[PDB]
Amino acid sequence: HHMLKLIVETKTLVQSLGFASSVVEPEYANIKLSAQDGNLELSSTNMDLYLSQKIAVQVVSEGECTVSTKTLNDIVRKLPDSELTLTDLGTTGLEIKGKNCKFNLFTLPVSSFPAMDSINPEASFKISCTDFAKIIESTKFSISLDETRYNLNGVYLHIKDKEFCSASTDGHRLSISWVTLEKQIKNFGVILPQKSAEEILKIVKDPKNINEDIEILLNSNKIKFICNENTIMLSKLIDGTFPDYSTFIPESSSSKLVINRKMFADSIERIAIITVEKFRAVKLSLSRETLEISAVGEARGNAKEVINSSQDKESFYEYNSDESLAIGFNPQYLEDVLKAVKSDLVELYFSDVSAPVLIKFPENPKDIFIVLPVKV
Protein backbone atom coordinates (compact mmCIF):
# COMPACT_ATOMS: atom_id res chain seq x y z
CA HIS A 1 0.00 0.00 0.00
CA HIS A 2 2.43 2.66 1.26
CA MET A 3 4.98 1.51 -1.30
CA LEU A 4 7.03 4.01 -3.27
CA LYS A 5 6.02 4.54 -6.89
CA LEU A 6 7.19 7.45 -9.03
CA ILE A 7 7.91 8.56 -12.58
CA VAL A 8 11.17 10.49 -13.04
CA GLU A 9 13.02 12.14 -15.92
CA THR A 10 15.98 9.84 -16.56
CA LYS A 11 18.54 12.60 -17.15
CA THR A 12 17.70 14.14 -13.78
CA LEU A 13 17.96 10.81 -11.95
CA VAL A 14 21.29 10.09 -13.68
CA GLN A 15 22.69 13.43 -12.44
CA SER A 16 21.56 12.77 -8.85
CA LEU A 17 22.99 9.24 -8.86
CA GLY A 18 26.29 10.67 -10.06
CA PHE A 19 26.50 12.88 -6.97
CA ALA A 20 25.28 10.09 -4.68
CA SER A 21 27.95 7.79 -6.12
CA SER A 22 30.92 10.08 -5.67
CA VAL A 23 30.26 10.94 -2.02
CA VAL A 24 30.58 7.32 -0.84
CA GLU A 25 33.94 6.64 -2.51
CA PRO A 26 31.27 0.96 -3.29
CA GLU A 27 29.40 -2.36 -3.36
CA TYR A 28 28.28 -1.98 0.28
CA ALA A 29 26.94 1.56 -0.22
CA ASN A 30 23.18 1.92 -0.14
CA ILE A 31 21.06 4.84 -1.28
CA LYS A 32 17.79 5.73 0.42
CA LEU A 33 14.94 6.75 -1.91
CA SER A 34 12.06 8.67 -0.34
CA ALA A 35 9.04 9.77 -2.41
CA GLN A 36 6.97 12.40 -0.58
CA ASP A 37 5.19 15.67 -1.38
CA GLY A 38 5.94 15.69 -5.10
CA ASN A 39 9.68 15.02 -4.83
CA LEU A 40 12.15 12.16 -4.62
CA GLU A 41 14.75 12.49 -1.86
CA LEU A 42 17.95 10.51 -2.42
CA SER A 43 20.24 10.04 0.58
CA SER A 44 23.85 8.79 0.63
CA THR A 45 26.17 8.68 3.61
CA ASN A 46 29.24 7.19 5.22
CA MET A 47 31.23 8.01 8.36
CA ASP A 48 32.24 11.52 7.22
CA LEU A 49 29.56 12.83 4.89
CA TYR A 50 25.78 12.81 4.45
CA LEU A 51 24.20 13.97 1.19
CA SER A 52 20.49 14.54 0.65
CA GLN A 53 19.17 15.51 -2.79
CA LYS A 54 15.57 16.31 -3.71
CA ILE A 55 14.35 16.30 -7.32
CA ALA A 56 10.86 16.91 -8.65
CA VAL A 57 9.12 13.72 -9.81
CA GLN A 58 5.59 12.49 -10.42
CA VAL A 59 4.83 10.79 -7.11
CA VAL A 60 2.25 8.07 -7.72
CA SER A 61 2.57 6.59 -4.23
CA GLU A 62 4.54 7.84 -1.22
CA GLY A 63 7.09 5.56 0.42
CA GLU A 64 10.74 4.82 1.08
CA CYS A 65 13.19 2.06 0.21
CA THR A 66 16.95 1.55 -0.07
CA VAL A 67 19.06 -0.24 -2.71
CA SER A 68 22.67 -0.60 -3.84
CA THR A 69 24.01 2.79 -4.95
CA LYS A 70 26.36 1.26 -7.53
CA THR A 71 23.78 -1.06 -9.08
CA LEU A 72 21.16 1.68 -9.36
CA ASN A 73 23.78 3.99 -10.85
CA ASP A 74 24.95 1.40 -13.37
CA ILE A 75 21.44 0.53 -14.51
CA VAL A 76 19.91 3.99 -14.89
CA ARG A 77 22.86 5.18 -17.01
CA LYS A 78 22.09 2.46 -19.57
CA LEU A 79 18.35 2.80 -19.98
CA PRO A 80 17.39 4.63 -23.19
CA ASP A 81 14.03 5.94 -21.96
CA SER A 82 13.62 9.65 -21.26
CA GLU A 83 11.45 8.77 -18.24
CA LEU A 84 11.56 5.80 -15.89
CA THR A 85 9.08 4.32 -13.43
CA LEU A 86 10.42 3.29 -10.03
CA THR A 87 8.12 1.04 -8.01
CA ASP A 88 8.84 -0.74 -4.75
CA LEU A 89 7.37 -4.21 -5.33
CA GLY A 90 8.21 -5.64 -1.89
CA THR A 91 9.82 -9.09 -2.09
CA THR A 92 10.15 -8.61 -5.86
CA GLY A 93 12.51 -5.65 -5.16
CA LEU A 94 12.65 -2.08 -6.42
CA GLU A 95 11.47 -2.21 -10.04
CA ILE A 96 13.15 0.20 -12.47
CA LYS A 97 11.01 0.12 -15.60
CA GLY A 98 11.40 1.56 -19.07
CA LYS A 99 9.37 0.86 -22.19
CA ASN A 100 10.84 -2.58 -22.90
CA CYS A 101 13.11 -3.33 -19.93
CA LYS A 102 12.58 -4.10 -16.21
CA PHE A 103 15.24 -4.41 -13.50
CA ASN A 104 14.43 -5.66 -10.01
CA LEU A 105 16.92 -4.58 -7.32
CA PHE A 106 16.80 -6.21 -3.90
CA THR A 107 15.96 -3.73 -1.17
CA LEU A 108 17.47 -3.39 2.27
CA PRO A 109 15.44 -2.28 5.32
CA VAL A 110 15.13 1.49 5.63
CA SER A 111 15.46 1.00 9.40
CA SER A 112 19.09 0.10 8.64
CA PHE A 113 19.65 3.52 7.05
CA PRO A 114 20.67 6.38 9.37
CA ALA A 115 18.94 9.74 9.46
CA MET A 116 21.00 12.86 8.92
CA ASP A 117 22.56 14.16 12.12
CA SER A 118 20.96 17.23 13.63
CA ILE A 119 23.04 20.41 13.75
CA ASN A 120 22.55 23.33 16.15
CA PRO A 121 24.73 25.93 14.45
CA GLU A 122 26.88 28.69 15.90
CA ALA A 123 27.13 30.55 12.56
CA SER A 124 24.75 30.70 9.59
CA PHE A 125 25.17 32.68 6.37
CA LYS A 126 24.55 32.59 2.63
CA ILE A 127 26.87 33.29 -0.31
CA SER A 128 26.53 32.87 -4.04
CA CYS A 129 27.51 29.53 -5.52
CA THR A 130 29.85 31.41 -7.85
CA ASP A 131 31.76 32.89 -4.91
CA PHE A 132 31.92 29.62 -2.97
CA ALA A 133 33.09 27.67 -6.01
CA LYS A 134 35.79 30.30 -6.51
CA ILE A 135 37.27 30.01 -3.03
CA ILE A 136 37.32 26.18 -3.05
CA GLU A 137 38.70 26.01 -6.61
CA SER A 138 41.51 28.37 -5.62
CA THR A 139 42.46 26.39 -2.49
CA LYS A 140 41.71 22.68 -2.84
CA PHE A 141 44.88 21.90 -4.85
CA SER A 142 47.36 22.88 -2.09
CA ILE A 143 45.83 20.75 0.67
CA SER A 144 48.31 18.43 2.37
CA LEU A 145 47.97 14.80 1.30
CA ASP A 146 50.11 13.71 4.28
CA GLU A 147 47.45 12.03 6.43
CA THR A 148 49.69 12.42 9.49
CA ARG A 149 49.50 16.24 9.37
CA TYR A 150 45.76 15.99 9.96
CA ASN A 151 45.26 19.72 10.59
CA LEU A 152 46.42 20.41 7.01
CA ASN A 153 44.37 17.70 5.26
CA GLY A 154 41.62 20.17 4.40
CA VAL A 155 40.70 23.77 3.67
CA TYR A 156 40.58 26.33 6.46
CA LEU A 157 37.23 28.13 6.22
CA HIS A 158 37.30 31.26 8.35
CA ILE A 159 36.04 34.82 8.86
CA LYS A 160 38.26 37.91 8.85
CA ASP A 161 36.24 41.11 9.38
CA LYS A 162 33.64 40.96 6.60
CA GLU A 163 35.60 38.43 4.53
CA PHE A 164 34.76 34.73 4.26
CA CYS A 165 38.04 33.04 3.42
CA SER A 166 39.50 29.67 2.53
CA ALA A 167 43.19 28.90 3.05
CA SER A 168 45.25 25.79 2.45
CA THR A 169 48.88 24.80 2.81
CA ASP A 170 51.04 21.70 2.52
CA GLY A 171 54.29 23.26 3.73
CA HIS A 172 55.55 24.09 0.23
CA ARG A 173 52.84 26.54 -0.83
CA LEU A 174 49.90 28.53 0.52
CA SER A 175 46.65 29.41 -1.24
CA ILE A 176 44.17 32.01 0.05
CA SER A 177 40.87 32.98 -1.55
CA TRP A 178 38.04 35.06 -0.12
CA VAL A 179 34.77 36.89 -0.78
CA THR A 180 33.12 39.78 1.02
CA LEU A 181 30.01 39.08 3.13
CA GLU A 182 27.32 41.71 3.58
CA LYS A 183 26.32 40.50 7.07
CA GLN A 184 28.34 40.70 10.29
CA ILE A 185 29.09 37.06 11.09
CA LYS A 186 30.78 35.82 14.25
CA ASN A 187 34.42 34.95 13.67
CA PHE A 188 34.87 31.21 13.14
CA GLY A 189 37.62 28.94 11.85
CA VAL A 190 37.07 25.32 10.83
CA ILE A 191 38.90 22.77 8.71
CA LEU A 192 36.83 21.10 6.01
CA PRO A 193 38.15 17.66 4.95
CA GLN A 194 39.55 17.37 1.43
CA LYS A 195 36.85 14.93 0.28
CA SER A 196 34.02 17.14 1.56
CA ALA A 197 35.56 20.15 -0.21
CA GLU A 198 35.81 18.20 -3.48
CA GLU A 199 32.23 16.96 -3.30
CA ILE A 200 30.59 20.26 -2.39
CA LEU A 201 32.54 21.96 -5.20
CA LYS A 202 31.10 19.60 -7.81
CA ILE A 203 27.64 20.28 -6.37
CA VAL A 204 27.82 24.07 -6.55
CA LYS A 205 29.34 23.92 -10.05
CA ASP A 206 26.39 21.96 -11.43
CA PRO A 207 24.60 24.04 -14.11
CA LYS A 208 21.42 24.00 -12.02
CA ASN A 209 23.25 25.47 -9.00
CA ILE A 210 26.09 27.70 -10.20
CA ASN A 211 23.90 30.81 -10.63
CA GLU A 212 22.17 30.41 -7.25
CA ASP A 213 23.13 30.63 -3.57
CA ILE A 214 24.50 28.30 -0.90
CA GLU A 215 23.67 28.49 2.81
CA ILE A 216 26.42 27.49 5.25
CA LEU A 217 25.64 26.42 8.82
CA LEU A 218 28.34 25.29 11.21
CA ASN A 219 29.55 24.73 14.73
CA SER A 220 32.80 23.34 16.14
CA ASN A 221 32.17 19.73 15.06
CA LYS A 222 30.02 19.73 11.89
CA ILE A 223 29.21 21.90 8.87
CA LYS A 224 26.02 21.81 6.77
CA PHE A 225 25.74 23.07 3.19
CA ILE A 226 22.30 23.80 1.73
CA CYS A 227 22.98 24.29 -1.98
CA ASN A 228 20.13 25.98 -3.87
CA GLU A 229 17.55 24.76 -1.34
CA ASN A 230 17.28 21.16 -2.55
CA THR A 231 20.76 19.70 -1.90
CA ILE A 232 22.03 19.33 1.67
CA MET A 233 25.48 18.05 2.64
CA LEU A 234 26.50 17.47 6.26
CA SER A 235 30.23 16.99 6.86
CA LYS A 236 32.39 16.38 9.89
CA LEU A 237 35.19 18.87 10.53
CA ILE A 238 38.83 18.12 11.27
CA ASP A 239 39.74 18.64 14.92
CA GLY A 240 42.93 20.67 14.72
CA THR A 241 44.43 24.14 14.66
CA PHE A 242 45.25 25.66 11.29
CA PRO A 243 48.58 27.53 11.37
CA ASP A 244 48.67 31.32 11.51
CA TYR A 245 49.39 31.76 7.81
CA SER A 246 49.38 35.59 7.84
CA THR A 247 53.13 35.74 8.50
CA PHE A 248 53.74 33.59 5.40
CA ILE A 249 52.58 36.29 2.98
CA PRO A 250 55.52 38.39 1.75
CA GLU A 251 54.96 42.03 2.64
CA SER A 252 57.59 43.38 0.23
CA SER A 253 59.23 42.34 -3.02
CA SER A 254 62.31 43.43 -4.93
CA SER A 255 61.23 42.38 -8.45
CA LYS A 256 58.01 41.72 -10.34
CA LEU A 257 57.21 39.51 -13.33
CA VAL A 258 54.09 40.06 -15.44
CA ILE A 259 53.57 37.34 -18.02
CA ASN A 260 50.88 35.78 -20.17
CA ARG A 261 49.46 33.04 -17.97
CA LYS A 262 48.87 30.37 -20.62
CA MET A 263 52.23 30.99 -22.29
CA PHE A 264 53.99 30.63 -18.93
CA ALA A 265 52.08 27.48 -17.93
CA ASP A 266 52.67 25.76 -21.29
CA SER A 267 56.39 26.54 -21.21
CA ILE A 268 56.79 25.28 -17.64
CA GLU A 269 54.96 22.07 -18.54
CA ARG A 270 57.11 21.53 -21.66
CA ILE A 271 60.41 22.10 -19.84
CA ALA A 272 59.39 19.94 -16.85
CA ILE A 273 59.08 16.86 -19.13
CA ILE A 274 62.82 16.19 -18.84
CA THR A 275 62.83 16.07 -15.02
CA VAL A 276 62.79 12.96 -12.83
CA GLU A 277 60.65 12.09 -9.82
CA LYS A 278 62.03 13.52 -6.52
CA PHE A 279 64.04 16.02 -8.61
CA ARG A 280 61.14 18.11 -9.91
CA ALA A 281 62.62 21.55 -10.49
CA VAL A 282 62.55 24.16 -13.22
CA LYS A 283 64.91 27.15 -13.21
CA LEU A 284 63.56 30.62 -14.05
CA SER A 285 66.41 32.83 -15.29
CA LEU A 286 64.71 36.22 -15.24
CA SER A 287 65.93 39.37 -16.93
CA ARG A 288 64.40 42.45 -18.54
CA GLU A 289 65.04 41.13 -22.04
CA THR A 290 64.30 37.40 -21.67
CA LEU A 291 63.12 34.66 -19.37
CA GLU A 292 64.90 31.33 -19.80
CA ILE A 293 63.00 28.38 -18.37
CA SER A 294 65.30 25.39 -18.06
CA ALA A 295 65.55 21.98 -16.43
CA VAL A 296 67.76 18.91 -16.20
CA GLY A 297 67.08 15.23 -15.77
CA GLU A 298 69.86 12.96 -14.55
CA ALA A 299 70.74 10.42 -17.27
CA ARG A 300 67.95 11.89 -19.47
CA GLY A 301 69.11 15.31 -20.72
CA ASN A 302 68.17 18.96 -20.32
CA ALA A 303 65.79 21.53 -21.75
CA LYS A 304 65.58 25.30 -22.23
CA GLU A 305 62.89 27.65 -23.54
CA VAL A 306 63.47 31.37 -24.13
CA ILE A 307 60.62 33.86 -23.66
CA ASN A 308 61.29 37.35 -25.04
CA SER A 309 60.02 40.63 -23.66
CA SER A 310 56.74 41.56 -25.34
CA GLN A 311 53.86 43.98 -24.84
CA ASP A 312 51.53 41.81 -26.95
CA LYS A 313 48.84 40.40 -24.67
CA GLU A 314 49.09 36.85 -26.04
CA SER A 315 52.88 36.67 -25.55
CA PHE A 316 53.19 39.27 -22.79
CA TYR A 317 56.45 39.39 -20.87
CA GLU A 318 57.62 42.24 -18.64
CA TYR A 319 60.27 42.03 -15.90
CA ASN A 320 61.16 45.53 -14.68
CA SER A 321 64.43 44.92 -12.85
CA ASP A 322 67.97 45.64 -14.02
CA GLU A 323 69.28 42.75 -11.89
CA SER A 324 68.90 39.21 -13.17
CA LEU A 325 67.36 36.56 -10.90
CA ALA A 326 67.75 32.79 -11.27
CA ILE A 327 65.23 31.02 -9.05
CA GLY A 328 63.94 27.45 -9.05
CA PHE A 329 60.49 26.00 -8.41
CA ASN A 330 58.74 22.67 -8.37
CA PRO A 331 56.86 22.99 -11.69
CA GLN A 332 53.75 21.28 -10.34
CA TYR A 333 53.27 24.01 -7.73
CA LEU A 334 53.45 26.77 -10.35
CA GLU A 335 51.20 24.84 -12.73
CA ASP A 336 48.61 24.30 -9.96
CA VAL A 337 48.36 28.05 -9.33
CA LEU A 338 48.33 29.00 -13.01
CA LYS A 339 45.47 26.55 -13.68
CA ALA A 340 43.36 27.76 -10.74
CA VAL A 341 42.40 31.24 -12.02
CA LYS A 342 41.26 32.05 -15.56
CA SER A 343 43.21 35.21 -16.35
CA ASP A 344 45.09 36.59 -19.34
CA LEU A 345 48.11 37.70 -17.29
CA VAL A 346 49.74 36.57 -14.04
CA GLU A 347 51.97 38.54 -11.65
CA LEU A 348 54.91 37.05 -9.72
CA TYR A 349 56.53 39.01 -6.90
CA PHE A 350 60.05 37.96 -5.93
CA SER A 351 62.74 38.67 -3.38
CA ASP A 352 65.86 36.47 -3.24
CA VAL A 353 66.44 32.93 -4.54
CA SER A 354 65.34 31.44 -1.20
CA ALA A 355 62.29 33.54 -0.50
CA PRO A 356 58.73 32.55 -1.47
CA VAL A 357 57.14 33.97 -4.60
CA LEU A 358 53.86 35.89 -4.20
CA ILE A 359 51.55 35.14 -7.13
CA LYS A 360 48.57 37.33 -8.04
CA PHE A 361 46.24 37.66 -11.02
CA PRO A 362 45.57 41.29 -12.02
CA GLU A 363 41.76 41.30 -12.27
CA ASN A 364 41.35 38.94 -9.28
CA PRO A 365 42.09 40.91 -6.09
CA LYS A 366 40.74 38.29 -3.65
CA ASP A 367 43.05 35.39 -4.57
CA ILE A 368 46.62 35.17 -3.25
CA PHE A 369 49.16 32.38 -3.69
CA ILE A 370 52.57 31.83 -2.05
CA VAL A 371 55.01 29.25 -3.40
CA LEU A 372 58.42 28.39 -1.97
CA PRO A 373 61.39 28.04 -4.34
CA VAL A 374 63.82 25.13 -4.57
CA LYS A 375 67.59 25.48 -4.96
CA VAL A 376 68.77 25.01 -8.56
Binding site: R149, G171, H172, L174, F248, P373, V374, K375
Partner: peptide
Protein backbone atom coordinates in the same frame (compact mmCIF):
# COMPACT_ATOMS: atom_id res chain seq x y z
CA UNK B 1 63.78 22.22 -0.55
CA UNK B 2 62.85 24.76 2.10
CA UNK B 3 59.39 24.71 3.68
CA UNK B 4 57.06 27.18 5.33
CA UNK B 5 57.66 27.74 9.05
CA UNK B 6 55.07 25.18 10.16
CA UNK B 7 56.25 23.81 13.49
CA UNK B 8 55.28 20.48 13.18
CA UNK B 9 57.21 19.69 9.96
CA UNK B 10 58.36 22.89 8.21
Amino acid sequence: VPTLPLVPXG
